[PDB]
Design a protein around this nucleic acid. Structure first.
Lengths: 97, 93, 51, 88, 79, 108, 97, 79
DNA sequence: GAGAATCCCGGTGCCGAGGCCGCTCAATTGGTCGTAGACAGCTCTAGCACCGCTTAAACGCACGTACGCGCTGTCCCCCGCGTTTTAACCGCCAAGGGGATTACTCCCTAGTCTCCAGGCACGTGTCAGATATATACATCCTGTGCA
DNA sequence: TGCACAGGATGTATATATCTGACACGTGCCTGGAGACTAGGGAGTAATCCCCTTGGCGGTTAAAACGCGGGGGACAGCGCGTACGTGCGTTTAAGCGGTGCTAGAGCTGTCTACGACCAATTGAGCGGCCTCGGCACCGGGATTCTC
């Protein structure tokens, strides 16, 4: 049959996800995560769905900004693949230690 | 009772685009936006009026605040629109 | 009252709608009236007391 | 350089003046349009940015072109002769 | 399975929204730790706003003020 | 004897007296001048008009009649001064711009 | 005929300037610089003496804060020497554009 | 010639404050490029502050007030 | 092994950091009144929990090819250093221009009563999408026959 | 063994009929913004004093500018192998959606005690002035990296 170059259908998937605006994290594991992390500070705590939504959009926006900064720091480092030392450099030069 | 800027925002887009609908989420985005500029301008003006040992907030205080907060191009358009509106309001004679 | 150009003192035919300054012709509008800084138009209008 | 010499030889072998003056005026209008596109606050550059955004939703070169247009106008004036004042 | 409740292609989805090309395998638990350490700072402020309000439920406004605290303000749910 | 509001006295469509009310019981200063709510009303009206103009041609560039926050997000981040004003704010359901660095393309 | 290796006296004077805390910029050219950047907006400007020292402390602190980050960027770039892309990478990761 | 007021051994003085063994010779013109902008951004928000006070001398109080507006509240000279 | 280059130990004005008293406003005490937080008590939105069907996404094992990384060889440009030279800085005198402050004025903004229409809230109608008939015409594919 | 022709089947093509489907407009209401009237104190104007800061000296001196030899560093280039992407089989547990229940948001009523406001008072923290020892500065010997 006919195949594709590794690194070409990746660009199609990148442009598909960047034209898209849909949410990329599943709702129920995220709600379990925020309830298990809110159990540490105060028990018997209920939640509202728009609060979970605001938390979710905040975290994916911060993750997208961090991933763009890591990509920029990695292509500064004469490479293509991102590694954890670029994550540490981006967090160190972003202020959050 | 709850307050929104929905009708005023509505007529604002009706002068510029008559055949244009609006989303409720977009209306909430716009309401949060105008309220944020309002609280920023108000706290800048109150802080400046406290800094000049003055107990009165006037038009020149928010004039300096608009010069301070907004970037220069949108700043002089904003103060131009405000000056024509204020001079039109002050002609009550 | 007669109308005169605020920049040159000649006969003012047109008035700019932004800063309300009477000017004489096109190149006066392009060189002086259009790119002038704020705070200068009020001083130009101070001479005839129009601010 | 032989090609350049041959081109010069061909040039030596070589209402129309009013049409050339109209072309010089159109080149001046093109320089004005390039200056309007350079200023992003202008409506021409705003329309160009709107066209770029619609495609997304689907200055030294201008000075060199103006210098070349002035050279072409000078060549046309020399061909007419041979073959912005402060007072205003 | 709560900390790793975020599945393996989800960090990939957030990565290609961030415009990366090649992803390593050791980033995933580190991004999980970064996520949990951001979330720890956010919801601590959110539940302090919650127990000040004499309530045991976290509704829509004490979270948007919580992200308004550190300069990561979000629009739309301010009412 | 009956006369209309201060907003059309200033020729504005935003509420002047409501801005004055929010300024007075917003607790910013103990004395508030007369011309300040008119100036603030004009500034916020102009900013809303400019934002809705940008959302307008952003939505005409998608061939639609309604405003989605995709259009708002685009009209914010393709303009540089609104980029400088709204750098630290995140919009609800906005996404990101289509961008790719030059060496990451299949240059060959 | 005693010649030092390049960089040893650099590290030694680095140690003395880590001990030292005085101002490192000349005062009168800095006054000339702030007057020549200040005359553009309203002429005949008077200047207090303490404000210029506050400005000098500000630019020295901002130099230190940016230079530490570009040092970390150049260390991360597998090099000993700084360059222009280190500087705009630090300004990009700090968020200063 | 007055734009050359900051001098190359003073840039070396700032460079040996940061703790780097090797400094390339084209950093010195880059360091001026990041300086004439940045202090400019306090001059945009100092003298207009001064202009609001009917004031034709800048002092020690309005400059730290401008830095507090920018985000670098500094100690030592009042305010 | 030597040599710059330090850390360390002791003598010197000094000048800027601790008392001190004079005293002038600002914290303290008391009283009165009008309202705002506290508590009780109430009506319904909405959040938690659970069952079950559908299925699209996710986990796992397999392999294949760039790409991260190890080594190398070389221009070469920063680096340490001697020599001019140039402006930075300290001591100082003199002006005058601009900030602080005192002092009376008057207007306009705070406060209160009245009162009616602005904008909310909640009802009813009107052009865009989706299955459906439908018959005839045209194109494409498959089968058969012929050379 | 291939090619051409004929026949059959499928797809297309453009108003209907229905027919929802989510949108934009015609009436209540109530309360808060606007007009009218009173008070008082906050900018505002201005003049006067005195303090600092902008220019102008001059000498001298750390300190920048400039040219010069040599040595590691960044530069491109080439090979080794494996880690990431690509894929199909195989779960699985997200999603819809539906229902059942009750905590708890939210609103209303009433109350009284905390706090605004005002007048008299006493003391304490600002300031001017006075006096001296901690630290920088200078000089000279011990001591540690570097070559």
């Amino acid at each position: 049959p006919h195949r594709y170059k590794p690194g070409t259908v990746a660009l199609r998937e990148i442009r598909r996800f960047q034209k898209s605006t849909e949410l990329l994290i599943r709702k129920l594991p995220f709600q379990r995560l925020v309830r298990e992390i809110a159990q540490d500070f105060k028990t018997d705590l209920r939640f509202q769905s728009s609060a979970i939504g605001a938390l979710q959009e905040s975290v994916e926006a911060y993750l997208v900004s961090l991933f763009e900064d890591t990509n920029l720091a990695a292509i500064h480092a004469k490479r293509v693949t991102i590694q954890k030392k670029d994550i540490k450099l981006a967090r160190r030069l972003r202020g959050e230690r | 009772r709850k307050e929104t800027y929905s009708s005023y925002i509505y007529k604002v887009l009706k002068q510029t685009h008559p055949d244009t609908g609006i989303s409720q989420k977009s209306m909430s985005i716009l309401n949060s936006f105008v309220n944020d500029i309002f609280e920023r301008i108000a706290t800048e003006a109150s802080k400046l009026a406290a800094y000049n040992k003055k107990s009165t907030i006037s038009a020149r205080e928010i004039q300096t605040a608009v010069r301070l907060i907004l970037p220069g191009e949108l700043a002089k358009h904003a103060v131009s629109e405000g000056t024509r509106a204020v001079t039109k309001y002050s002609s009550s004679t | 009252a007669k109308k005169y150009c605020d920049v040159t003192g000649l006969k003012g035919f047109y008035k700019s709608p932004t800063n309300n300054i009477r000017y004489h012709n096109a190149e006066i509008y392009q060189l002086i009236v259009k790119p002038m800084a704020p705070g200068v138009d009020q001083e130009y209008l101070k001479l005839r007391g129009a601010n | 350089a032989k090609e350049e010499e041959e081109k010069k030889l061909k040039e030596q072998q070589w209402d129309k003046r009013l049409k050339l003056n109209k072309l010089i005026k159109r080149r001046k209008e093109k320089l004005k349009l390039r200056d309007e596109m350079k200023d992003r606050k202008s409506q021409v550059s705003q329309n160009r940015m709107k066209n770029l955004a619609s495609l997304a939703e689907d200055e030294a070169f201008e000075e060199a072109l103006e210098y070349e247009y002035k050279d072409i106008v000078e060549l046309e004036r020399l061909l007419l002769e041979h073959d912005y004042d402060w007072r205003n | 399975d709560n900390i790793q409740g975020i599945t393996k292609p989800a960090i990939r989805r957030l990565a290609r929204r961030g415009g990366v090309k090649r992803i390593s395998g050791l980033i995933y638990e580190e991004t999980r730790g970064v996520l949990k350490v951001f979330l720890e700072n956010v919801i601590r402020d959110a539940v302090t706003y919650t127990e000040h309000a004499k309530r045991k439920t976290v509704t829509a406004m004490d979270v948007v003020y919580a992200l308004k605290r550190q300069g990561r303000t979000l629009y739309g749910f301010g009412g | 004897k009956a006369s209309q509001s201060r907003s059309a006295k200033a020729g504005l469509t935003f509420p002047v007296g409501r801005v004055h009310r929010l300024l007075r019981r917003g607790n910013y200063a103990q004395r508030i001048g007369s011309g300040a709510p008119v100036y603030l009303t004009a500034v916020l009206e102009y900013l809303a008009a400019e934002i809705l103009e940008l959302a307008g041609n952003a939505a005409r560039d998608n061939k639609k009649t309604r405003i989605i926050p995709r259009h708002l997000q685009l009209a914010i981040r393709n303009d540089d001064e609104l980029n400088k004003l709204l750098g630290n704010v995140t919009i609800a359901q906005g996404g990101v711009l289509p961008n790719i660095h030059q060496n990451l393309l299949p240059k060959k």
